[PDB]
Design a protein around this ligand. Structure first.
Ligand SMILES: CCCCCCCC/C=C/CCCCCCCC(=O)OC[C@H](O)CO
Ligand SMILES: CCCCCCCC/C=C/CCCCCCCC(=O)OC[C@H](O)CO
Ligand SMILES: CCCCCCCC/C=C/CCCCCCCC(=O)OC[C@H](O)CO
Ligand SMILES: CCCCCCCC/C=C\CCCCCCCC(=O)OC[C@H](O)CO
Ligand SMILES: CCCCCCCC/C=C\CCCCCCCC(=O)OC[C@H](O)CO
Ligand SMILES: CCCCCCCC/C=C\CCCCCCCC(=O)OC[C@H](O)CO
Ligand SMILES: CCCCCCCC/C=C\CCCCCCCC(=O)OC[C@H](O)CO
Ligand SMILES: CCCCCCCC/C=C\CCCCCCCC(=O)OC[C@H](O)CO
Ligand SMILES: CCCCCCCC/C=C\CCCCCCCC(=O)OC[C@H](O)CO
Ligand SMILES: CCCCCCCC/C=C\CCCCCCCC(=O)OC[C@H](O)CO
Ligand SMILES: CCCCCCCC/C=C\CCCCCCCC(=O)OC[C@H](O)CO
Ligand SMILES: CCCCCCCC/C=C\CCCCCCCC(=O)OC[C@H](O)CO
Ligand SMILES: *C/C=C(C)/C=C/C=C(C)/C=C/C1=C(C)CCCC1(C)C
Ligand SMILES: *C/C=C(C)/C=C/C=C(C)/C=C/C1=C(C)CCCC1(C)C
Ligand SMILES: *C/C=C(C)/C=C/C=C(C)/C=C/C1=C(C)CCCC1(C)C
Lengths: 230, 230, 230
C-alpha cells in the first residue's frame, strides 16, 4: 500500500492474530473456574487488538486532523482498541491479587479517563491545547501506576507465593511498557512531530505486542491462575 | 413518509413498544430477587429496540455510505441497538444455567466483536473489504453458538429440570434466529444487493421482534426464573 | 474568550477540579472496603465532569446543529459526561441501601435510555421531533424517580438508622435536582429557546456542581459508608 507505515500495521495484525489463536487453543479444555477467567480476559485482549490493527491497515481507522497548518494523519482506532484492552489488562492484575471492588473501579475509571483524554488530545485542532490533554492523561496514568505499586504490591505478598511472584513480574512489565506510551505520543506525529509516523508506528507495534501477547505468555504459563487444589 | 421501508419501521416501533409495556406491567410486584433479574434484563431489551426503531423511522438512524459507485442508505442505528441488546439476551441464558464468570465474559466480549466488526463492515467504503469484516463477525458468531451448544447445554442438564427445559427451547430459538442475521446482511443492501432495502427491512423486523419479544414471552412465562422455594 | 457563557464554563471547571482533589485527599488512607467503594465512585464523578467542562471551555465539546432555520450551538459534551456520571450517582444510592442486582440493572439501564435519548433529541434537525425525544427521556427519568421513592425508601428503613437517614437526605436532594434538568433543556437553547445560552449554562453549572460535589460532601461525611465494626 502507499503508506510507508503499512508494513508495521501488517506485522502487528499478524502477530495479534497469531497470539489470539495460540491463547484460544491453549485455553481449550481448561475447567478450573479461576483459570477460565484469566483465559477469557487474556484472549480477548489480542482479539480486539487484531480487529483494530486490521482497521488501520485497511485505512478505516485513520483520519485527518488539521493542526499546525497541516493535515495530520491521526490513527484514531488506537484509542478504540485501548479503551477496551487496557482495563482488561488491569483486571488480570487485580484478580490475581484479589483486589477489593472499590480499588478495581478506581483503576478502571482512571484508565478510562487516560484513554478518553488521549483521544480528545489526538483530535484537538488547537495545537497548544493538545498538550493540555496529554498532561491530564499522563496524570491519570501516574495514579494508576501508584495504585499498582503502593496498594497491589502489599496485598500480593500476603497471598500465595506463586501469586506474589507472578504479580511482581507482570507489574514490572506493566510499569515499564505503559510509561513509554506518553513519551512516544509526545515526540511523534500526535505531538511535537520529531519522530516520523512510520517510526512511531513501529515503536507502538513493539509496545502493543509486548504488553498484550508478551504479558499474556507470562501470565498463562503461570501456576497462579489456578485455584490451590489437591 | 417517502421511504418505502417506512411501514416496517413503524410496525417494528409499535411492536417493540407494546412488548416493553407488557413486560413492564407483568413484572410489577414481582419480589423474588432471581425473577427480578430476568424481568430487568428482558424488559430493557425491547425498550432499547423501541428507541432505535423510532430513530430509524424518523430518519435520524440513517446515513449514506458511498460504495459500488452509489450512495447507499445504511441504517447505522441497528448496530447501536444490537451492541446493547444482544449481550443482554446472552446474559438471560447464562444466568439461567448459572454460567461461570469467565464464560460470561468470553460470550459478551465475542458478542461485542461481532457487532463492532459488523458496524465497521457496514460503513466501509471499499466494497470488497466489506466482506472481510462480515467474515470476522461471522467467526465471532460461530464461537458464541459453539459455547451455547458445547458448554451451556452440559451445565443445564445438571440443573433443575425446568431450568434445563426452558434453556433448551431458548437456546434452539437463539441459534436459529441469530444464524439468519449474517445471511440477510450478505444478500441485502449492506452486501451483494440482491434483496432490496424494503424487503430486507421486513426480514430484519420479523427477526428482531421474534428474537426479543418472542424470546421474552417464552422466558418470562417459565417457572425457571424463580428460586425453588416453598 | 468570545463566548459569553465562557465564565460559567471556567467556574464549573474550577469547582469540579477542586471537588475532585478534595475527595481524593480525603479518601487517602481509608481502609474499610465498604468506604473504599463509596470514595471510588464519588471521586470519579467530579473527575469525569472536570474533563468534560474543560472540553466545553476549550471549545472541543461544542457543535452546530441546524434547526429552526438557524445554526444552534449545542454542547454535546454534557451528554458524554452524564452518560458516565449519572449511573455512578445511582450506584452510590443503591449500594447504600444494598439494592438487589435486578433493580440496579433496571436503574442503570433506564438512566442510559434517559441520557441516550436526550443526546438524540439535542442533535435532531427536525424541530418538532426534538420534543418527542425529550418526552421519552423524561418518561425514563420518572421511572427512575419512582424506583428511588417506592422501592429504595422501603429497604432503607429496614436497614441501619444512619443508612436510613443518609439515604433519605440524598434521595431528596437527587429528586429535586434531577427534576430541574428536563425543564432547563425545554426552555433553553436545545428546546423552545426562551432562556438564552449564557443563562442556561449558569443554571446547568449550578445544578451540576450541587448534584455532584454537594451530593458527595453529604455522603462522604456520613457514617453510613462504613461497615458497622467495633
Ligand atoms: C525482540 C527482538 C527484536 C529486537 C528489536 C527491538 C527494536 C525496537 C526499537 C526500534 C527502533 C528502531 C529505530 C530505527 C530508526 C531509523 C530512522 C531513520 O531512518 O533515521 C534516519 C532519518 O531518515 C534521518 O535522520
Ligand atoms: C407469524 C405469522 C405471520 C407469518 C409471516 C411470515 C413472513 C416472513 C417472511 C417474509 C418474506 C416476504 C417476501 C415478500 C417478497 C416480495 C418481493 C417482490 O415484490 O418481489 C418481486 C420483485 O419486485 C421482482 O422480482
Ligand atoms: C449558594 C449561594 C449562591 C446562591 C446563588 C443562586 C443562583 C441560582 C440561580 C441563578 C439565576 C440567575 C438569573 C439571572 C438572570 C439575568 C438575565 C437577564 O439579563 O435578563 C434580562 C434580559 O437581558 C432581558 O429581559
Ligand atoms: C486541577 C485538578 C484536576 C483534577 C485532577 C485530574 C483529573 C484526572 C486525573 C486523574 C484521575 C484521578 C483518579 C480518580 C479516581 C479516584 C479513585 C479513588 O478515590 O479511589 C479511592 C479508593 O479508596 C481507592 O481504592
Ligand atoms: C465505572 C465506569 C467509569 C467510566 C469512566 C469513563 C471516563 C471517560 C471520561 C472522559 C472522556 C470522554 C471522551 C469523549 C470523546 C468523544 C470524541 C468523539 O466522539 O468525537 C466525535 C467528533 O469527532 C467530535 O464531535
Ligand atoms: C514514569 C514515566 C513518566 C512519563 C512522562 C515523562 C514526560 C517528560 C519526558 C520527556 C520530555 C522531554 C522534552 C520533549 C519536548 C521537546 C520539545 C522540542 O521542540 O524539542 C526540540 C527537538 O528536540 C529538536 O527539534
Ligand atoms: C487470523 C486469526 C484472527 C483472530 C481470530 C478472529 C478474532 C475475532 C473472532 C472471534 C473471537 C474469538 C473468541 C474470543 C474470546 C475467547 C474467550 C476464551 O478464550 O474463553 C476461554 C474461557 O475458558 C471460556 O469459558
Ligand atoms: C469485557 C468488555 C469487552 C468489550 C469488547 C468490545 C469489542 C469491540 C472491538 C472492536 C470493534 C470496535 C468498533 C469501533 C467502530 C467505530 C465506528 C465509528 O464510530 O465510526 C466513526 C466514523 O464514522 C468514522 O471515523
Ligand atoms: C449456521 C449459520 C451460518 C451462517 C453463514 C452462512 C454463509 C454462507 C451462506 C450463503 C452464501 C451463498 C452465496 C451468496 C453470494 C452470491 C453472490 C452473487 O453475486 O450471487 C449472484 C446472485 O445470486 C444473482 O445475481
Ligand atoms: C409507547 C411505549 C414506549 C415504551 C416505553 C418507553 C421506553 C423508554 C422509557 C422508559 C424505560 C422504562 C424502564 C425500563 C426498564 C424496566 C426495568 C424492569 O422491568 O425492572 C423489573 C425489576 O423487577 C425491577 O426491580
Ligand atoms: C445493562 C446495560 C444497559 C445499557 C443501556 C443503554 C441504553 C441506550 C439506548 C438507546 C440510546 C442510543 C443513543 C445513540 C446515539 C448516537 C449518536 C451519535 O453518535 O451520533 C453520531 C452522528 O452525530 C450521527 O450519525
Ligand atoms: C417532577 C418533574 C417533572 C418534569 C417535567 C415537567 C414538564 C412540564 C413543565 C413545564 C412546561 C411549561 C410550558 C413550556 C412550553 C412553552 C412554549 C412557548 O412557546 O411558550 C411561550 C413563552 O412562554 C413566551 O414566548
Ligand atoms: C495494549 C496497549 C496498551 C497497554 C496501551 C497503553 C496505553 C497508554 C498507557 C496510553 C497513555 C497515554 C498517555 C498517558 C498520554 C496521552 C496519550 C496516551 C493515551 C497514549
Ligand atoms: C435483537 C436482535 C438480535 C438478536 C441481533 C442479532 C445480531 C446478529 C447475530 C448479527 C450478526 C452479524 C454477523 C454475524 C455478520 C455481520 C453482520 C451482523 C452484525 C448482522
Ligand atoms: C451530574 C449531573 C446530573 C445529575 C445529570 C442529570 C441529568 C438528567 C436528569 C437529564 C435528563 C434529561 C431529560 C429527562 C429530558 C431530556 C434532556 C435531559 C437529558 C437533560
Amino acid at each position: 500500500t502507499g503508506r510507508p507505515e503499512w508494513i508495521w500495521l501488517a506485522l502487528g495484525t499478524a502477530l495479534m492474530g497469531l497470539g489470539t489463536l495460540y491463547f484460544l487453543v491453549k485455553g481449550m479444555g481448561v475447567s478450573d473456574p479461576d483459570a477460565k477467567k484469566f483465559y477469557a480476559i487474556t484472549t480477548l485482549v489480542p482479539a480486539i487488538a487484531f480487529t483494530m490493527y486490521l482497521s488501520m491497515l485497511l485505512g478505516y481507522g485513520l483520519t485527518m486532523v488539521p493542526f499546525g497548518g497541516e493535515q495530520n494523519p491521526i490513527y484514531w482506532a488506537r484509542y478504540a482498541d485501548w479503551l477496551f484492552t487496557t482495563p482488561l489488562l488491569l483486571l488480570d492484575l487485580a484478580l490475581l491479587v484479589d483486589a477489593d471492588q472499590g480499588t478495581i473501579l478506581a483503576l478502571v475509571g482512571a484508565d478510562g479517563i487516560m484513554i478518553g483524554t488521549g483521544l480528545v488530545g489526538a483530535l484537538t485542532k488547537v495545537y497548544s491545547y493538545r498538550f493540555v490533554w496529554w498532561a491530564i492523561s499522563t496524570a491519570a496514568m501516574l495514579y494508576i501506576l501508584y495504585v499498582l505499586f503502593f496498594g497491589f504490591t502489599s496485598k500480593a505478598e500476603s497471598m500465595r507465593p506463586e501469586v506474589a511472584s507472578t504479580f511482581k513480574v507482570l507489574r514490572n512489565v506493566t510499569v515499564v511498557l505503559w510509561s513509554a506510551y506518553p513519551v512516544v505520543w509526545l515526540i511523534g506525529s500526535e505531538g511535537a512531530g520529531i519522530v516520523p509516523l512510520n517510526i512511531e508506528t513501529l515503536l507502538f507495534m513493539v509496545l502493543d505486542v509486548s504488553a498484550k501477547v508478551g504479558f499474556g505468555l507470562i501470565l498463562l504459563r503461570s501456576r497462579a491462575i489456578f485455584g490451590e487444589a489437591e
